[PDB]
Design a protein around this nucleic acid. Structure first.
Lengths: 418, 407, 418, 412
RNA sequence: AAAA
RNA sequence: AAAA
């Protein structure tokens, strides 16, 4: 009997996430109505299956109306509706619904920081997302449903959906990461913590500042190892573009530690492999052909040769103080990653889990299982995935009541078709 | 007595454009009140439109309850609820003292969030949210604008044409595109008025996450439209900066052919930080294919070659290289870039082998402004000299571009 | 109000083609019922839109009955069916329908040669596919509808669908191919005729026979040029596998005419490019390097080296007599393609149009247009597509009443989801 | 006492429909095969095969010809007790259900049709239901013993040995003795992967990439451990067989077999390699090592349109390949197959290993309810893929029948 | 669409 | 069209 209505945007994600957020306040609709201006490109019944996995069976009817305000007037008014979410869609659609829907309740999902919007459901932490009764103005709490009838335990999750998994799980209690000893991380584990942003260098903000000034960058090996994918944002400036040059010396050092032979894997090969993959994620290998191993003087000399031949200032980025001093002596702008700070704000938990799953799936010695637990009990385990371009991790859920990755997997497929 | 109100969003572009759209329906308010959610040359631009108004920014704070009680404490005639959050628009249309609530309806939102006038005004409808009828445009003339010359980017020049079009027939004089010489035909492709069918193949390959290398002619003819063709949401900018193409563009840029390769190098630098670190030293057909093969051998990504040369493309395909060959042409039946066309035609005009000629914009047969090529180290502008002081909108678009750049 | 019911098999293609064959007998249902023993793994959506372009505009419903002949007993008995098609699905399912259905007609689609089945709709010529009333035994003739409300002129068609387009169009009258003098083809046009199977060499039967004996083949350039993709079937048996070795001499000759430089395109460059593409579709380029051997003796000398170091018999294939005689004087078994045969049976019309579109799109002089005309009236034009692995031809329909490629394009997307 | 069935163009369906009915306890004197086309069997040891089952029968073939009308005419007069309609076209099955003199119409229902069209007994009989279509009762299996054989020895392919186990399982508990797989040594672990009893988690990635049209190169350990199961993993209906024959892998396999302990794996790998590939004799690659395989993959990647993927069981090699831009599938994680796997492949692998084990030679035996039935012996031939089965219990010599059945279907 |  |  319960009818839940909403508005159908050209964006699929807002309409989807508005419906999904409402289901997480305990509501169990039996019919969902999507009022549309224009027909939708193509939807799927996978929304029905994803809702089914949350204990909800519902008919999903789309009603196409058109542009007219009076046409929206009439069809909204004489439609039997119990709850009406108005977060998606144009402003005139929400106005028409609010004033003229016969709904008992009209609701609105309030996202304080819109910069975190338009991502997979659960990506934004649920403390920063508010469901509001627009008629009274009251924050309305989340009642997170459990998963049901989920036959498949394994799913493939990207970094954003892995973080969404943690946030959705966090509605039920305390989520914890097992397999990492946060008080005594080894060399690679410390590297993964920097790569995820849990630990940062204060001088990263100097990289941002120099990017605004339009300088060009060259980085040594450890910048790629420790900053990882986060280096892309630091060196990108909206007005000047991608300022990081593809250092020949840095690639040569990464190549010599990873590609010359099939040496057995120890901690230092995993560390240099993390740098090599991060380097490849940002640059095509500039070395079409060259093999020369210098390390310290090589990067400085490469920066000097570039300095002589471009108008822009060349800033050298390194985590090595001795190299940084030598570069400054030869007249080079330098950013030395030295000051560690632990992040109290936002960081990439998904990236950390990706990095740790990669480390433990290929390390020598006594490896560890990377697991996610809720209120002390194990919920899922994590395994690396071969495909490095469409980056996924394999989540095996050991608790049938909390298999949100399967829903997130289906939702990711819906979002990807757009 | 006449007071116009709107909402203050985190974007300045929506609040600004909502005010200007309302003014362009004939409105001349004395007070403009912007109801904001937090403490965040506009008055000069409204001055240039004959509007002498007080712009007051009234902060209410977060919460729908705070708005339900404070939005009423003001006298308003016309409230435009287009910008801002939904709940801010919700309470404003229900608890304001406004005789008229309006909404600037954007038919296609992908054209939004630009400078005022960028959207063609046939796609922009001002409506009263209670009746729903279209409110016709009553475009004001420019007043007290004494400086005739302005510097406009490619989008502002398009906005000038559209705003001028509200007054009548807009024409360009000094160009005959029939029999487009080599450069003229190129400017048509750069502007998008003429397009290659195989541009869809670039879009399709970009959706699949391929990397691209393009020859010199692709940068020349596709221009900066390459930016949207090779950009995918999932993987981003898929066009590699070919060292072979840069070498050939640098060599030619070291006078009809010179225009071609300056246009190509301009687009290249606007799309790429040049590949300074690459050791490739070739500047020919086989150099491009061989550069593509070397990249293909060493990267995870799929490599696709873009060329406008059948002989190159067929040779590349004979070496196992997936290739997009721009051959077949279609006349665009929808949107293209008049500003890019005029920027391109202005640059050519100064270096034509014939006699110097003037490109001008006219309204209903009467000359409005002239377009002059302007060269700066970094900026990409055209100098517009308005000779009809009633239509000196470039001065206003110049001011608005400044305010948007402050973002 | 026609309710056309049918059986739903694990194959979607047998279901899909059964409905479409019924609708090409004038039938215009408003409801279509699919009876299922199992719920379909996939979920078809464009099946409705395909029928809308044929002016049908029906409902589709999947009745899941399950295992058991009584369960198929009862749930078929109390269901209103006018016309029932029993072509798809298990035999027990058809028996339940032809026994306990209140259907007026019960229809079977008879396919004489099954080997041409399970393909895109319209692939088998409609003169080899019969619609039969099971009660009477009589052959209901075809009433091919036209296309309605389809304004997207352009479509992308694979080889099979292109031949299906011709067969569907042939239901209305004389289908002709414009842009080629069939009786006076030029060098490349003659090559396309052999590649398409319109003309064959009688000695192709010798290739099949020597394959069944487990011989190994070396083929010169003209074999790849003139036989094209048809060569794959000729050199393959289920027992001994793919018998064609990747000749180093043939690739060198193909490379020198196509890849050594960016020479302008004339007839001969197109001819050798067709050979190079065919060669690449059958072998990995064997020479990791160069040997700079090209001509008559190179292939024979290559065949002699292989013969002296491999146990299986080595058979040279060529279309050049002088090379063929020279090889036999050196003690090599040789298959010489000399005797032409015009195909009175089945050949590959889609491949011919592919080959001609490629030739005319990268041609030399006067711009010839490849068109498909019906009853003298231009129906569509053809253009080449960049992607050689997923092979397509761009079809532009100039007649809104015959835009079957859009339906075949939609159906192809459904078939690919398997 | 007359059994009828339909004659399809495929011999296997008509044959297996007859054999399944015999295994529901039927002992006919006359079998009628109703056909549509003038074709025949061209030879049949079916009477000899059925004679070994205690079925002294005559097999008759009635040609009718295309048409629903002709079928309706010629079916009523035929006196038949049991008619099976599983093979053939629908219409021939449709007429034989409505216009036949048979008192009982039956249908052999196969749960997963992907397992069909194989030698009789290949499908586990739990998946095979004989159904009377009038009511719908499942008819229980009543398997006949073997009579009048006197030839103990047979040569069976992998699929017949599996068919032997399944048919023998209708009489109760089948066990394999002389084999202890727990505590698996190096070769025993290999045989378990080849048979599919243990599978790699990353085999799913091979399927995924194959559906996307990728080309594959594999190192030596993939051929050794995956064996002939590679044929299914690297085959896609849209693009075909996607595994390139690596010259680096062939050189390593050739060096270890053509010029003992631990040589068993490399023979097994080479047998799988040749079964999947015509050896790349035309390739000029001469390396036989880790870097050689990666470098061969790079040169192919550079020169071909297809995406190139490397398969290896060596993490150090795979991580090196990934460092060079190569997309790599690394087989590392193991799952115990909860479902179907190849018992015949395991026994073929273990039999071959048995002749070269250390210390004592142990004989592999198959038993029924604790009683020995047959022994498995390795047999060597140039193009065989055969095992030698000596049945010691006259009552259960189904290999002899399967040998005859393998011959009939071989002429396909 | 001749063990779906 | 989660602050045109």
């Amino acid at each position: 009997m319960l009818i839940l209505a909403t508005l159908g945007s050209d964006k699929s994600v807002t309409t989807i996430n508005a419906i999904l957020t409402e289901i997480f306040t305990g509501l169990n609709p039996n019919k969902i109505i999507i009022f549309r201006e224009d027909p939708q490109k193509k939807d799927i019944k996978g929304m029905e299956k994803a809702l089914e996995y949350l204990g909800v069976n519902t008919l999903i009817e789309e009603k196409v109306i058109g542009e007219g305000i009076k046409l929206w007037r009439e069809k909204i008014r004489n439609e039997e509706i119990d709850i009406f979410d108005i977060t998606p869609g144009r402003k005139y659609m929400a106005l028409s619904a609010t004033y003229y829907s016969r709904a008992e309740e009209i609701r609105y999902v309030y996202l304080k920081d819109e910069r975190e919007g338009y991502n997979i459901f659960g990506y934004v932490p649920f403390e920063q997302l508010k469901v509001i009764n627009v008629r009274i103005g009251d924050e309305i709490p989340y009642d997170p449903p459990l998963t049901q009838n989920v036959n498949e335990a394994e799913s493939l999750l990207d970094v954003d959906s892995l973080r969404a998994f943690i946030n959705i799980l966090g509605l039920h209690g305390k989520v914890e990461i097992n397999g990492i000893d946060l008080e005594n991380p080894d060399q690679v584990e410390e590297i993964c913590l920097f790569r995820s942003g849990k630990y940062k260098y204060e001088e990263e903000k100097d990289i941002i500042k120099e990017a605004e000034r339009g300088s060009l960058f060259l980085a040594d090996t450890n910048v790629y190892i420790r900053l990882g994918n986060r280096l892309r944002s630091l060196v990108y400036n909206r007005k000047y573009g991608f300022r990081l040059l593809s250092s020949k010396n840095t690639f040569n050092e990464l190549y010599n530690h990873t590609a010359q032979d099939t040496q057995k894997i120890d901690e230092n090969k995993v560390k240099f492999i993390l740098g090599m993959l991060s380097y490849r994620s940002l640059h095509v290998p500039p070395i079409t052909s060259q093999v020369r191993s210098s390390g310290d003087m090589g990067l400085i000399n490469e920066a000097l040769e570039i300095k002589k031949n471009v108008e822009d200032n060349v800033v050298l980025i390194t985590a090595d103080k001795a190299l940084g001093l030598t570069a400054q002596s030869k007249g080079l702008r330098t950013i030395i990653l030295s000051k560690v700070r632990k992040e109290i704000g936002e960081w990439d938990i998904g990236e950390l889990l990706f990095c740790l799953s990669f480390y433990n799936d290929y390390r020598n010695g006594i490896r560890r299982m990377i697991e996610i637990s809720l209120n002390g009990s194990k919920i899922a385990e994590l395994h690396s995935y071969y495909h490095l371009q469409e980056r996924r991790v394999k989540v095996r859920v050991v608790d049938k009541r909390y298999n949100y990755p399967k829903i997130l997997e289906i939702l990711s497929e819906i979002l990807a078709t757009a």
